[PDB]
Amino acid sequence: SVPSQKTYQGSYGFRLGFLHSVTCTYSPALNKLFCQLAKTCPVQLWVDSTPPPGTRVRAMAIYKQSQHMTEVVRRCPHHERCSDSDGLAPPQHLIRVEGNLRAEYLDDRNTFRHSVVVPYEPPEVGSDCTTIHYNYMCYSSCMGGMNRRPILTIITLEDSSGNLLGRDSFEVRVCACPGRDWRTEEEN
Ligand SMILES: [Zn+2]
C-alpha cells in the first residue's frame, strides 16, 4: 500500500513551517527541502490550538513518482552498514530525529515501512511553534537505495492510538550541494 499524502490541518490546524536559509534550505515554490547528508533539518510544527497530552508526531518517507510509490524507502547497502548509529535509530532507517531521547522507531509489520515518532511538545515560553530536528541518512543518489528517485517526507500528527489528527508533507533531495541544486531546480 501507499500512505496518504493529502494535506489535512484537522481540528488543531496543524501545518509545518520551514526556516528561511548552505547545508539545508527549503523552497516554498517547489515545496522541497534540499539538505546535506546527516545534517540538521529544522522543521517547525504549527497549530491553532494545543492538541491533547499523548499526541505524537510521525515522519515517514515515500517515493514521489507513481511507478515507485509502492517501494519502501530505506538506506542503501553501504549506509545501512556504516555503524553511524546514534543508539536509538535502527541502521536501515533513512530519517532520524536528532536530540530527543523519547524518539521511537517503527518497522511496520504489514507495510514494512519505516517511521520515527516523537511526543508532540507544546511551544516553550516566548515561542509560537515547536521545532523538530531531523537528519536524512542517505543521499538521493545512493545506488541500491533511492537511486536518484525523489522522495516525499510525510509528517503526521497522531493521537495516542496512532489515529490521524493532521498531515503535511514536503519533497526532499539529500545532496552534496543543496545551494546549487536548489538554484538549478528553481530555475527549471
Ligand atoms: Zn546511502
Coordinates of N, CA and C and ligand atoms in Angstrom, one line a residue:
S1 N 0.8 -1.2 0.0 CA 0.0 0.0 0.0 C 0.9 1.3 0.0
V2 N 0.2 2.4 -0.1 CA 0.9 3.7 -0.2 C 0.2 4.6 0.8
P3 N 1.0 5.1 1.8 CA 0.4 6.0 2.8 C -0.1 7.3 2.1
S4 N -1.2 7.8 2.7 CA -1.8 9.0 2.1 C -0.9 10.2 2.2
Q5 N -0.9 11.1 1.2 CA -0.1 12.3 1.3 C -1.0 13.6 1.3
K6 N -2.3 13.4 1.5 CA -3.2 14.5 1.4 C -3.0 15.5 2.6
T7 N -2.8 16.8 2.3 CA -2.6 17.8 3.4 C -3.9 17.8 4.2
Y8 N -3.9 17.8 5.5 CA -5.0 17.8 6.3 C -4.7 18.6 7.6
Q9 N -5.3 19.8 7.8 CA -5.0 20.5 9.0 C -5.7 19.9 10.2
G10 N -6.8 19.4 10.0 CA -7.6 18.8 11.2 C -8.1 19.8 12.2
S11 N -8.6 19.3 13.3 CA -9.2 20.1 14.3 C -8.3 21.1 15.0
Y12 N -7.0 20.8 15.0 CA -6.0 21.6 15.7 C -5.3 22.6 14.7
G13 N -5.6 22.6 13.5 CA -5.0 23.5 12.5 C -3.5 23.2 12.3
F14 N -3.2 21.9 12.2 CA -1.8 21.5 12.0 C -1.1 21.8 10.7
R15 N 0.0 22.4 10.7 CA 0.8 22.6 9.5 C 2.3 22.8 9.8
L16 N 3.1 22.6 8.8 CA 4.6 22.7 9.0 C 5.1 24.1 8.7
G17 N 6.3 24.4 9.2 CA 6.9 25.7 8.8 C 8.4 25.4 8.6
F18 N 9.1 26.2 7.8 CA 10.5 26.0 7.5 C 11.2 27.3 7.6
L19 N 12.5 27.3 8.1 CA 13.3 28.5 8.2 C 13.6 29.0 6.9
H20 N 14.0 30.3 6.9 CA 14.5 30.9 5.7 C 16.0 30.9 5.7
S21 N 16.6 30.0 4.9 CA 18.1 29.9 5.0 C 18.8 31.1 4.4
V22 N 25.2 26.5 1.9 CA 24.2 26.2 2.9 C 24.0 24.7 3.0
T23 N 23.7 24.2 4.2 CA 23.5 22.8 4.5 C 22.1 22.3 4.4
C24 N 21.2 23.2 4.5 CA 19.7 22.8 4.5 C 19.0 24.1 4.1
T25 N 18.2 24.0 3.0 CA 17.4 25.1 2.5 C 16.1 24.6 2.0
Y26 N 15.0 25.3 2.3 CA 13.7 25.0 1.8 C 13.1 26.0 0.8
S27 N 12.5 25.4 -0.2 CA 11.9 26.2 -1.3 C 10.4 26.1 -1.3
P28 N 9.7 27.2 -0.9 CA 8.2 27.1 -0.8 C 7.6 26.9 -2.2
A29 N 8.3 27.5 -3.3 CA 7.7 27.4 -4.6 C 7.7 25.9 -5.1
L30 N 8.7 25.2 -4.7 CA 8.8 23.8 -5.1 C 8.3 22.8 -3.9
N31 N 8.0 23.4 -2.8 CA 7.6 22.6 -1.6 C 8.6 21.5 -1.4
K32 N 9.9 21.9 -1.4 CA 11.0 21.0 -1.4 C 12.2 21.4 -0.5
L33 N 12.6 20.5 0.3 CA 13.8 20.7 1.2 C 15.0 20.1 0.5
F34 N 16.1 20.9 0.5 CA 17.4 20.4 -0.1 C 18.3 20.3 1.1
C35 N 19.0 19.2 1.4 CA 19.9 19.1 2.5 C 21.1 18.2 2.3
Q36 N 22.1 18.4 3.1 CA 23.3 17.5 3.0 C 23.0 16.3 3.9
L37 N 23.8 15.3 3.7 CA 23.7 14.0 4.4 C 24.0 14.2 5.9
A38 N 23.1 13.7 6.7 CA 23.2 13.7 8.2 C 23.4 15.1 8.8
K39 N 22.9 16.1 8.2 CA 22.9 17.5 8.7 C 21.5 17.8 9.3
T40 N 21.5 18.7 10.3 CA 20.3 19.1 10.9 C 19.3 19.8 10.0
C41 N 18.1 19.3 10.0 CA 17.0 19.9 9.2 C 15.9 20.3 10.1
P42 N 15.8 21.6 10.5 CA 14.8 22.0 11.4 C 13.4 22.1 10.7
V43 N 12.4 21.5 11.3 CA 11.1 21.5 10.8 C 10.2 22.0 11.9
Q44 N 9.4 23.1 11.6 CA 8.5 23.7 12.7 C 7.1 23.0 12.6
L45 N 6.5 22.9 13.8 CA 5.2 22.4 13.8 C 4.3 23.5 14.3
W46 N 3.3 23.9 13.6 CA 2.4 25.0 14.0 C 1.0 24.4 14.2
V47 N 0.3 24.9 15.2 CA -1.1 24.5 15.5 C -1.9 25.8 15.9
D48 N -3.2 25.8 15.7 CA -4.1 26.9 16.1 C -4.5 26.6 17.6
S49 N -4.6 25.4 18.0 CA -4.9 25.0 19.3 C -4.1 23.8 19.7
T50 N -3.7 23.8 21.0 CA -2.9 22.7 21.5 C -3.6 21.4 21.6
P51 N -3.1 20.3 20.9 CA -3.7 19.0 20.9 C -3.5 18.4 22.3
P52 N -4.3 17.3 22.5 CA -4.2 16.6 23.8 C -2.9 16.0 24.2
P53 N -2.7 15.8 25.5 CA -1.4 15.2 26.0 C -1.4 13.8 25.4
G54 N -0.3 13.3 24.9 CA -0.3 12.0 24.3 C -0.2 12.0 22.8
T55 N -0.4 13.2 22.3 CA -0.4 13.4 20.8 C 1.1 13.2 20.4
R56 N 1.3 12.6 19.2 CA 2.6 12.3 18.7 C 2.8 12.9 17.3
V57 N 4.0 12.9 16.9 CA 4.4 13.4 15.5 C 5.2 12.4 14.8
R58 N 4.8 11.9 13.7 CA 5.5 10.8 13.0 C 6.0 11.3 11.6
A59 N 7.2 10.9 11.3 CA 7.8 11.2 10.0 C 8.1 9.9 9.2
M60 N 7.7 9.9 7.9 CA 7.9 8.7 7.1 C 8.2 9.2 5.7
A61 N 9.1 8.5 5.0 CA 9.4 8.9 3.6 C 8.8 7.9 2.6
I62 N 8.4 8.4 1.5 CA 7.8 7.6 0.4 C 8.4 8.1 -0.9
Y63 N 8.5 7.3 -2.0 CA 8.9 7.8 -3.3 C 7.8 8.6 -3.9
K64 N 8.2 9.7 -4.5 CA 7.2 10.6 -5.1 C 6.6 10.2 -6.4
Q65 N 7.3 9.5 -7.3 CA 6.9 9.0 -8.6 C 5.9 7.9 -8.4
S66 N 4.8 7.9 -9.2 CA 3.8 6.9 -9.1 C 4.4 5.5 -9.3
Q67 N 5.3 5.3 -10.3 CA 5.8 4.0 -10.5 C 6.7 3.4 -9.4
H68 N 7.1 4.3 -8.4 CA 7.9 3.8 -7.3 C 7.3 3.9 -6.0
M69 N 6.1 4.6 -5.9 CA 5.4 4.8 -4.6 C 5.3 3.5 -3.7
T70 N 5.1 2.3 -4.3 CA 5.0 1.1 -3.5 C 6.2 0.5 -2.9
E71 N 7.4 1.0 -3.4 CA 8.7 0.5 -2.9 C 9.1 1.2 -1.5
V72 N 9.4 0.4 -0.5 CA 9.8 1.0 0.8 C 11.1 1.8 0.6
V73 N 11.1 3.0 1.2 CA 12.3 3.9 1.2 C 13.2 3.5 2.4
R74 N 14.4 3.1 2.1 CA 15.4 2.7 3.1 C 16.8 3.1 2.7
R75 N 17.7 3.0 3.7 CA 19.1 3.3 3.4 C 19.7 2.3 2.5
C76 N 20.7 2.8 1.7 CA 21.3 1.9 0.7 C 22.2 0.9 1.3
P77 N 22.7 -0.1 0.6 CA 23.5 -1.2 1.1 C 24.8 -0.7 1.8
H78 N 25.3 0.4 1.4 CA 26.5 1.0 2.1 C 26.2 1.7 3.4
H79 N 25.3 2.6 3.3 CA 25.0 3.4 4.5 C 24.3 2.5 5.6
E80 N 23.5 1.5 5.3 CA 22.9 0.7 6.4 C 24.0 0.0 7.2
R81 N 25.2 -0.1 6.7 CA 26.3 -0.8 7.3 C 27.5 0.1 7.8
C82 N 27.2 1.4 7.9 CA 28.4 2.2 8.3 C 28.5 2.5 9.8
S83 N 27.7 1.8 10.6 CA 27.8 2.0 12.0 C 27.8 3.4 12.6
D84 N 27.1 4.3 12.0 CA 27.0 5.7 12.4 C 25.8 5.8 13.3
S85 N 25.5 4.7 14.0 CA 24.4 4.6 14.9 C 24.4 5.7 16.0
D86 N 23.2 6.1 16.4 CA 23.1 7.1 17.4 C 22.6 6.5 18.7
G87 N 22.5 5.2 18.7 CA 22.0 4.4 19.9 C 20.5 4.1 19.9
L88 N 19.7 4.8 19.1 CA 18.3 4.6 19.0 C 17.8 4.3 17.6
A89 N 18.3 4.9 16.6 CA 17.8 4.6 15.3 C 18.3 3.3 14.7
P90 N 17.4 2.5 14.1 CA 17.9 1.2 13.5 C 18.7 1.7 12.3
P91 N 19.8 0.9 12.0 CA 20.6 1.3 10.8 C 20.0 1.4 9.4
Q92 N 18.9 0.8 9.2 CA 18.2 0.8 7.9 C 17.4 2.1 7.7
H93 N 17.1 2.8 8.8 CA 16.2 4.0 8.7 C 16.8 5.2 8.0
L94 N 16.1 5.8 7.0 CA 16.6 7.0 6.4 C 16.5 8.2 7.3
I95 N 15.3 8.3 7.9 CA 15.0 9.5 8.7 C 15.3 9.3 10.2
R96 N 16.1 10.2 10.8 CA 16.3 10.2 12.2 C 15.8 11.5 12.9
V97 N 15.5 11.4 14.2 CA 15.2 12.6 14.9 C 16.4 12.9 15.8
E98 N 17.0 14.1 15.7 CA 18.1 14.4 16.5 C 17.8 15.0 17.9
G99 N 18.6 14.6 18.9 CA 18.4 15.2 20.2 C 17.1 15.0 21.0
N100 N 16.4 13.9 20.9 CA 15.2 13.6 21.6 C 15.2 12.2 22.0
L101 N 15.5 11.9 23.3 CA 15.5 10.6 23.9 C 14.2 9.8 23.8
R102 N 13.1 10.6 23.6 CA 11.8 9.9 23.5 C 11.4 9.5 22.1
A103 N 12.3 9.6 21.2 CA 12.0 9.2 19.8 C 11.9 7.7 19.7
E104 N 10.9 7.2 19.0 CA 10.7 5.8 18.8 C 10.7 5.5 17.3
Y105 N 11.4 4.4 16.9 CA 11.5 4.0 15.5 C 10.6 2.8 15.2
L106 N 9.8 2.8 14.2 CA 8.9 1.7 13.8 C 9.2 1.1 12.5
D107 N 9.1 -0.2 12.5 CA 9.2 -1.0 11.3 C 7.8 -1.7 11.2
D108 N 7.0 -1.2 10.3 CA 5.6 -1.7 10.2 C 5.5 -3.1 9.8
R109 N 4.8 -3.9 10.5 CA 4.6 -5.4 10.3 C 3.9 -5.7 9.0
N110 N 3.0 -4.8 8.6 CA 2.2 -5.1 7.4 C 2.6 -4.4 6.1
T111 N 3.2 -3.2 6.3 CA 3.7 -2.4 5.1 C 5.2 -2.5 5.0
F112 N 5.8 -2.8 6.1 CA 7.3 -2.9 6.2 C 7.9 -1.5 6.1
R113 N 7.1 -0.4 6.1 CA 7.7 0.9 6.0 C 8.2 1.4 7.4
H114 N 9.2 2.2 7.3 CA 9.9 2.8 8.4 C 9.4 4.1 8.8
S115 N 9.4 4.4 10.1 CA 9.0 5.8 10.5 C 9.6 6.1 11.9
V116 N 9.7 7.4 12.2 CA 10.2 7.8 13.5 C 9.2 8.7 14.1
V117 N 8.8 8.5 15.4 CA 7.8 9.3 16.0 C 8.2 9.8 17.4
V118 N 7.8 11.0 17.7 CA 8.1 11.7 18.9 C 6.9 12.3 19.6
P119 N 6.9 12.5 20.9 CA 5.7 13.1 21.5 C 5.6 14.6 21.0
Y120 N 4.4 15.1 20.8 CA 4.3 16.5 20.5 C 4.5 17.3 21.8
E121 N 5.3 18.3 21.7 CA 5.6 19.2 22.8 C 5.0 20.6 22.4
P122 N 4.2 21.2 23.3 CA 3.6 22.5 23.0 C 4.8 23.5 23.0
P123 N 4.6 24.6 22.4 CA 5.7 25.6 22.3 C 6.2 26.0 23.7
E124 N 7.5 26.3 23.8 CA 8.1 26.8 25.1 C 7.7 28.3 25.3
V125 N 8.1 28.8 26.4 CA 7.9 30.2 26.7 C 8.6 31.1 25.8
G126 N 7.9 32.1 25.2 CA 8.4 33.0 24.3 C 8.5 32.5 22.9
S127 N 7.9 31.3 22.7 CA 7.9 30.7 21.4 C 6.5 30.5 20.9
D128 N 6.3 30.4 19.6 CA 5.0 30.3 19.0 C 4.8 28.9 18.2
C129 N 5.9 28.2 18.1 CA 5.9 26.9 17.5 C 6.9 25.9 18.1
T130 N 6.8 24.7 17.7 CA 7.7 23.6 18.2 C 8.5 23.2 17.1
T131 N 9.8 22.9 17.3 CA 10.7 22.6 16.2 C 11.3 21.2 16.4
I132 N 11.3 20.3 15.4 CA 11.8 19.0 15.4 C 13.1 19.1 14.5
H133 N 14.2 18.4 15.0 CA 15.3 18.4 14.1 C 15.5 17.1 13.5
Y134 N 15.4 17.0 12.2 CA 15.6 15.7 11.5 C 16.9 15.6 10.8
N135 N 17.3 14.3 10.5 CA 18.5 14.1 9.8 C 18.1 13.0 8.7
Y136 N 18.6 13.2 7.5 CA 18.4 12.2 6.4 C 19.8 11.5 6.3
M137 N 19.7 10.2 6.3 CA 21.0 9.4 6.4 C 21.5 8.7 5.2
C138 N 21.0 9.1 4.0 CA 21.4 8.5 2.8 C 21.2 9.6 1.7
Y139 N 22.1 9.6 0.6 CA 21.9 10.6 -0.4 C 20.8 10.2 -1.4
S140 N 20.1 11.1 -2.0 CA 19.1 10.8 -3.0 C 19.7 10.0 -4.1
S141 N 21.0 10.2 -4.4 CA 21.7 9.5 -5.5 C 22.3 8.1 -5.1
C142 N 22.2 7.7 -3.8 CA 22.8 6.4 -3.4 C 22.3 5.2 -4.3
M143 N 23.3 4.5 -4.8 CA 23.0 3.3 -5.6 C 22.5 2.2 -4.7
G144 N 21.5 1.5 -5.2 CA 20.9 0.4 -4.4 C 20.0 1.0 -3.3
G145 N 19.8 2.3 -3.3 CA 18.9 3.0 -2.3 C 18.0 3.8 -3.1
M146 N 17.9 5.1 -2.8 CA 16.9 6.0 -3.5 C 17.3 6.0 -5.0
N147 N 18.6 5.8 -5.3 CA 19.0 5.8 -6.7 C 18.4 6.9 -7.6
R148 N 18.6 8.2 -7.2 CA 18.2 9.4 -7.8 C 16.7 9.6 -7.9
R149 N 15.9 8.7 -7.3 CA 14.4 8.9 -7.3 C 14.0 9.9 -6.2
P150 N 13.2 10.9 -6.5 CA 12.8 11.8 -5.5 C 11.8 11.2 -4.4
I151 N 11.9 11.7 -3.2 CA 11.1 11.2 -2.1 C 10.3 12.4 -1.5
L152 N 9.3 12.0 -0.8 CA 8.4 12.9 -0.1 C 8.5 12.5 1.4
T153 N 8.6 13.5 2.3 CA 8.5 13.2 3.7 C 7.1 13.5 4.1
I154 N 6.4 12.6 4.8 CA 5.1 12.9 5.3 C 5.1 13.0 6.8
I155 N 4.6 14.1 7.3 CA 4.6 14.3 8.7 C 3.2 14.2 9.2
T156 N 2.9 13.3 10.1 CA 1.5 13.2 10.6 C 1.4 13.5 12.1
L157 N 0.3 14.1 12.5 CA 0.1 14.4 13.9 C -0.9 13.3 14.2
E158 N -0.6 12.5 15.3 CA -1.5 11.4 15.6 C -1.9 11.4 17.1
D159 N -3.0 10.7 17.4 CA -3.4 10.7 18.8 C -2.6 9.5 19.4
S160 N -2.9 9.2 20.7 CA -2.1 8.2 21.4 C -2.3 6.8 20.9
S161 N -3.3 6.5 20.1 CA -3.6 5.2 19.5 C -3.0 5.2 18.1
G162 N -2.5 6.3 17.6 CA -2.0 6.4 16.2 C -3.0 6.8 15.2
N163 N -4.2 7.2 15.6 CA -5.2 7.7 14.6 C -4.8 9.1 14.1
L164 N -5.1 9.4 12.9 CA -4.8 10.6 12.3 C -5.5 11.9 12.8
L165 N -4.7 12.9 13.1 CA -5.2 14.2 13.6 C -4.8 15.3 12.6
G166 N -3.7 15.1 11.8 CA -3.3 16.1 10.9 C -2.2 15.5 10.0
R167 N -2.0 16.1 8.8 CA -0.9 15.7 7.9 C -0.4 16.8 7.0
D168 N 0.9 16.8 6.8 CA 1.5 17.7 5.9 C 2.7 17.0 5.2
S169 N 3.3 17.5 4.2 CA 4.4 16.8 3.5 C 5.2 17.8 2.7
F170 N 6.4 17.3 2.3 CA 7.3 18.1 1.5 C 8.3 17.1 0.8
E171 N 8.7 17.5 -0.4 CA 9.7 16.8 -1.1 C 11.1 17.0 -0.5
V172 N 12.0 16.0 -0.7 CA 13.3 16.2 -0.1 C 14.3 15.7 -1.1
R173 N 15.4 16.4 -1.3 CA 16.6 16.0 -2.1 C 17.8 16.0 -1.1
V174 N 18.4 14.9 -0.9 CA 19.6 14.8 0.0 C 20.7 14.8 -0.9
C175 N 21.6 15.9 -0.9 CA 22.6 16.0 -1.8 C 23.9 16.7 -1.3
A176 N 25.0 16.6 -2.1 CA 26.2 17.2 -1.6 C 26.2 18.7 -1.6
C177 N 25.5 19.4 -2.5 CA 25.4 20.8 -2.6 C 24.0 21.4 -2.7
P178 N 23.3 21.4 -1.6 CA 21.9 21.9 -1.6 C 21.7 23.3 -2.3
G179 N 22.6 24.2 -2.0 CA 22.6 25.5 -2.5 C 22.5 25.5 -4.0
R180 N 23.4 24.8 -4.7 CA 23.5 24.7 -6.1 C 22.2 24.0 -6.7
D181 N 21.8 22.9 -6.1 CA 20.7 22.2 -6.7 C 19.4 22.9 -6.5
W182 N 19.3 23.7 -5.4 CA 18.1 24.5 -5.2 C 17.9 25.5 -6.3
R183 N 19.0 26.2 -6.5 CA 19.0 27.2 -7.6 C 18.7 26.6 -9.0
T184 N 19.3 25.5 -9.2 CA 19.0 24.8 -10.5 C 17.5 24.5 -10.7
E185 N 17.0 23.8 -9.6 CA 15.6 23.4 -9.7 C 14.6 24.6 -9.7
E186 N 15.0 25.7 -9.0 CA 14.1 26.9 -9.0 C 14.1 27.5 -10.4
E187 N 15.3 27.5 -11.1 CA 15.5 27.9 -12.4 C 14.6 27.1 -13.4
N188 N 14.8 25.8 -13.4 CA 14.0 25.0 -14.3 C 12.5 25.2 -14.1
Ligands
ZN1 ZN 23.4 5.7 1.0

